[PDB]
Amino acid sequence: TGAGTPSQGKKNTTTHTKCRRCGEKSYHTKKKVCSSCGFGKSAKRRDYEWQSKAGE
């Protein structure tokens, strides 16, 4: 069985869903953690300096 097309047919699991806190479809319903805003992981909002150029 190929890792490509044939293996894509098995994908019918729902993981990332609309987040209650930020509105992005990034709330992982199995982990109950938003990969975009951090909801479920931290009270503080998910942020990182690498999301932009170092001097900007």
Please report, in range form, the residues annotated as the binding site for Zn(2+).
19, 22, 34, 37
Q: Out of Sr ion, RNA, none, which partner does residue 10 contact, by CB within 5 to 8 A per kind?
A: Sr ion
Cβ-based nearer residue to RNA, 4 or 48: 48
Residue 48 near RNA by CB under 7 A: yes
> Which position among 4, 6, 47, 50 is part of the footprint of Sr ion (CB under 5 A)?
47
Other CB atoms within 10 A of residue 33 CB: 17
For 3, 5, 10, 55, the CA distances from 16, given in Å and listed in that order, are 22, 22, 17, 32
